[PDB]
Amino acid sequence: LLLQTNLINYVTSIRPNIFVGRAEGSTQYGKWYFEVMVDEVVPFLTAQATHLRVGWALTEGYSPYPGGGEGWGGNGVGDDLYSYGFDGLHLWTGHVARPVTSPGQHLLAPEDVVSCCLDLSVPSISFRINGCPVQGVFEAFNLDGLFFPVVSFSAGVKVRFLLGGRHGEFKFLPPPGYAPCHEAVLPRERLRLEPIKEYRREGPRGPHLVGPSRCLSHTDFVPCPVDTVQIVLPPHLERIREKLAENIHELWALTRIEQGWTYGPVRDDNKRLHPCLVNFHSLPEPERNYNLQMSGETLKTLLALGCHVGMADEKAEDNLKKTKLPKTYMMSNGYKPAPLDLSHVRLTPAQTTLVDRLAENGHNVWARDRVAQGWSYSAVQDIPARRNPRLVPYRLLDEATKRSNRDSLCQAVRTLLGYGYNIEPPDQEPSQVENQSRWDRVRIFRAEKSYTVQSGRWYFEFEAVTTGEMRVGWARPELRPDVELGADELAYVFNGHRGQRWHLGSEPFGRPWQSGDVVGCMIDLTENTIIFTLNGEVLMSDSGSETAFREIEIGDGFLPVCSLGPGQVGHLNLGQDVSSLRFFAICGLQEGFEPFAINMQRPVTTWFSKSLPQFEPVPPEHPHYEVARMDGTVDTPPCLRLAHRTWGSQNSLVEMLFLRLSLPVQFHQHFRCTNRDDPEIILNTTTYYYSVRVFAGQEPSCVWVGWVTPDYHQHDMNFDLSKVRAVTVTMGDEQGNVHSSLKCSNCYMVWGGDFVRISHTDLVIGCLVDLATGLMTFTANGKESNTFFQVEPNTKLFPAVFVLPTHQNVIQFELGKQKNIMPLSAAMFLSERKNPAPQCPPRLEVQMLMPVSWSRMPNHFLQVETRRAGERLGWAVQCQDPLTMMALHIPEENRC
């Protein structure tokens, strides 16, 4: 009942920028192997034991924000269902440690070599320690997102990543069929060790705030071209079917003539003397007409894209000629340009964009075909192993190969343009790659509410390290963390991507910044005005006013606020040291303004918008959702009914709603195996019950009813029971025979569509838990379902319903009892363990999932050092100065 506190170490995580995944028709191999060599570990640098785990993690939810978190903080590899870790004695996942037998087990000590494997084919994550198999395997886990290696550690460790090849030597042969992890660096990046998602990095002059980063989704490795089959070939294309083919029959041959690759009558193409500029008649017939119909195929891509041709001017055939250059002279049947010659011809930007996507659709058809023949990607080419360094979608290819591909089709479209046939751009359709997660877009860093200013004249600077979408300005204390700055009335901010004011909307105001610009924001609360300066020059509106905003009411106060978009960095200088402020004196000093932090001896504490979905109580004043705490008549048990206020109205917000009741039911620490009520059964029972009434009108296929563990942070606006986290930790003997197959998750739910012709009767889904067996059961409408769950001892499980509203009467929690099954209130409250009368005390209240919440930024962060130790030593990690935190633990929610 009383908030518990303790001192806990800070824990961080480091990964290579190697991401591997699996999907239908993905260009990625599915068998990966990496090692970590432990060099030094101080077992107890603080009171709390030193943290060190290795493992794999997922790119769609493994975000270990420094500081608090699940349980007692110190979240590393294995403190959620997105990471899979190992510490030498235990296998960690879902914040549960499960002992694993290894031959000589012990915590990770100096001179230890941990070999982690991922076969994403079954999905599995094996391990070895010092070359000895670790008898325990994660399996059957979620395969969305991308997997990267990761080590979690507190201060006082030194480790070394071994990625094979020139980044390590593995000390141990990878088990057969596995690929070293250095073969997954994409052709545009360099192998390096980086922290997981971060909101802060150290900078030259001071800390650099960092906005969200864009990680590759597993569907960015599948090449998805435009189908080029269902295209009837037009007359105007077959009319030009030849020259556009003749000009790409030896165009690749033109570059190397009169060089070491100079043709010879004895040989032909592909004989280190390739050119053979004579004609394609001398060349083999199948590849010949294949080249003709490949020129046609490029034109077919032009058709499917939306390119059409039209002839206007003088026929280029007349005013074009073939040039027998002194270069490219050959003895085999005369000399000529290897492709078909062309005179002065130009290309408009429409053709540039068109040839870019035209080359993309060539690469992506080629890659698709190669994958369909089994091939995959590898930064080192292995032909007999059928792996290529270029099996990636065009967007991920390197600029050298992009250009090399673009050259050929640029020549083709150039030859087409010479003949005067129009290259018609297609229609333009604006599309967004990712739309659901609108919240994983913007990070808002504000000063603490304790610094709110209600008077005086204040100043602070913000350096735009990357010209992008960032907003800087002043903000009232009760700033919502989930609205863009200035959209509401709680912020007066400046957006620099294109110069815009923001308060209750947008107005064009000022220049756009470039990289390195310093925006000095200042407020005069005597005149009630806000001024922005860009590099010491005041920004002026078009009307001529020198104040961005005027007539601002002082109100409760104002705070410095900053908003960094995806991939955006910035430096917020509140001015604790005046000399640091670069453009203060030029504009801001003589006018009377003071730096915001002028004697904040300790640097100003800041809070950021933490995009981790927490469950929070439904606000009593909410524009859309209302909760009625209906009491209990004789026929009806106590309820908590959810109603949608604005259904049918114009401003209706219809979206997935993740509801849960505030208090959990805890399972017994030891399990038993190793109408009117019978008083002795009801008093000696451990089965508990609660139902949910899905009212008529609310479609039963849009409701999921059940339980959630206290670590459900998944605000997924497209929910289904295949998007719930899952894993299967399997413990076996020396031979591999299983001894345990524990199945873990965080959402134990049933879909109302399993239970459901016309819908006018409500659906009463009942849920039962046996707290001394660990077994969970559901009843559809009286009939027993076929979904049973088993949960290990001592777990917590909140009641929960996930519903997409389809009626203004959505659902209704019902805290009743069956015959010889106690109600929830008996399980939830200790005082009621023997009371069989259903209750609904004021602590039981429906909570909903909020996408974003404010969170403190730590004053001091861990100092990790990474360096490529050598070609054979591999990448090294080293943290040695300790950091602690005085935690505060909310016991019912199991969070810190």
């Binding site: 518990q4 001192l7 077992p43 107890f44 009171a47 004695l89 915590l107």
Partner: protein
């Protein structure tokens, strides 16, 4: 009653005979995973003479199997721990304790 699980091996040669004080730094937790004590927070190693029954029982068959420098984890059942009465205000009745014990020096 007490289940010793080695976390990091010590010497496996010198074991605490009766009458040798044992210096052990430790941390203790209810089986549900909550902490009631650590010596590392106080910052001083805890010394006890084995054979004088100052410590709870399981803590006394338990730190006897350990060797010098070893770090292990003991799981004392209430029979070989406080038991049905408890340590009022610290340990609830009928409780099993888990101790991360590091036997630092003997005497």
């Amino acid at each position: 009653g007490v289940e010793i699980e080695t976390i990091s091996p010590g010497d496996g040669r010198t074991f605490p005979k009766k009458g040798q004080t044992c210096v052990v730094h430790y941390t203790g937790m209810l089986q549900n995973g909550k902490k009631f004590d650590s010596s590392r927070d106080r910052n001083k190693p805890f010394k006890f003479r084995i054979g004088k029954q100052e410590v709870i029982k399981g803590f006394e068959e338990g730190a006897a199997q350990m060797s010098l420098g070893q770090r292990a984890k003991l799981t004392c059942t209430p029979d070989v721990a406080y038991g049905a009465t408890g340590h009022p205000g610290v340990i609830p009745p009928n409780a099993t304790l888990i101790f991360d014990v590091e036997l630092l020096n003997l005497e």
